Structure formats: structure tokens, C-alpha cells
């Protein structure tokens, strides 16, 4: 009930992956400022983007079994950590996140729905979690 939410909301965002990104990392910048140093260029910010949406697209194809993926998130999280992201700025990434999905489904944005793409991208974090381990 809760990976069908997901799937379904995915497609339209599917439609155009970059420009819903771009919404998304507009949001984050807007509300935690401070992250926009960490990155590098134009290209090097748009391609990181799109790293982002095929990470979570990996997330929707795995939405019933997460624990496939958890070595990978680990290392992704082990990784970010590396280049100076704190833990806690992934908690701006998810209200970026469902304020990206709520601007491009307005309506069809269900509290259900809502609550199921807050859990599949709780679970995305707390497997990342363990590369600040
Ligand atoms: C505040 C949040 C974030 C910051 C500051 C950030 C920053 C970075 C930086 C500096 C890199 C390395 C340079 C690059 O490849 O462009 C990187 C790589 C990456 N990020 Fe992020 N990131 C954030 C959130 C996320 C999230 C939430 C995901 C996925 C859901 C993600 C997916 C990736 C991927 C796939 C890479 C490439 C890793 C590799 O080369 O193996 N990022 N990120």
C-alpha cells in the first residue's frame, strides 16, 4: 500500500529528473545556506543532481527490501562524510525532498503518501548513518 504511494508519486517526478532535483537542492539551499560551500561548479552541482535522483531511483526500484542496498548506503554515507557533510543536514535533504514532491503533485500529495516517501527516505539515511560509524 505504502510502495505503491511511493512508485506512483516517483513516475511524475520521473517525467524530468533534473528540473524536480533542481527544485529540491533550491529548497535546501534556502533553508541551510551554509551547505551551498561544499559543492564545486555549475556542472560538477547539476551532475551531483542527478547522482542524487538515480540514487533515489535505485531507493523506489528496492522500496520492499531496502537491506539490498544497505553496504552501498553505508559507503555513500561514508563518503559524504569524507567531503564534510554533517549528519544532520540529511534531515534538511528529506524536508527538501517532500517540499519538491508536494510543489510537483499539489493534491495527489496524500498525508499517506507523504508519510510513505518520510519513511523510504528515513530508511535511505539510517543505512547512510553507519558511514559516520
Ligand atoms: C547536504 C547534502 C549533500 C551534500 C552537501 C552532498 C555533497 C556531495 C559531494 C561533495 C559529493 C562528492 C562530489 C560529487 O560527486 O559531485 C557527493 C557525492 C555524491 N552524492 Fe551527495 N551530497 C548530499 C546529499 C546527497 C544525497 C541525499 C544523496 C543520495 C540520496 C547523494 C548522492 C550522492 C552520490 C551518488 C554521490 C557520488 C558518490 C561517488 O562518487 O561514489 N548526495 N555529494
Known amino acids: 500500500p505504502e510502495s505503491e504511494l511511493i512508485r506512483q508519486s516517483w513516475r511524475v517526478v520521473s517525467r524530468s529528473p533534473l528540473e524536480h532535483g533542481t527544485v529540491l537542492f533550491a529548497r535546501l539551499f534556502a533553508l541551510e545556506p551554509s551547505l551551498l560551500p561544499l559543492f564545486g561548479s555549475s556542472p560538477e552541482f547539476l551532475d551531483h543532481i542527478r547522482k542524487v535522483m538515480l540514487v533515489i531511483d535505485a531507493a ?16 555513500l554515507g561514508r563518503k559524504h562524510r569524507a567531503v564534510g557533510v554533517r549528519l544532520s543536514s540529511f534531515s534538511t535533504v528529506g524536508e527538501s525532498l517532500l517540499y519538491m514532491l508536494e510543489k510537483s503533485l499539489g493534491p495527489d500529495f496524500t498525508p499517506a503518501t507523504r508519510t510513505a516517501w518520510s519513511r523510504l527516505y528515513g530508511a535511505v539515511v539510517q543505512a547512510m548513518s553507519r558511514g559516520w560509524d
Open 60 to 75: 523506489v526500484t528496492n522500496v520492499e527490501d531496502l537491506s539490498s542496498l544497505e553496504e552501498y548506503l553505508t559507503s
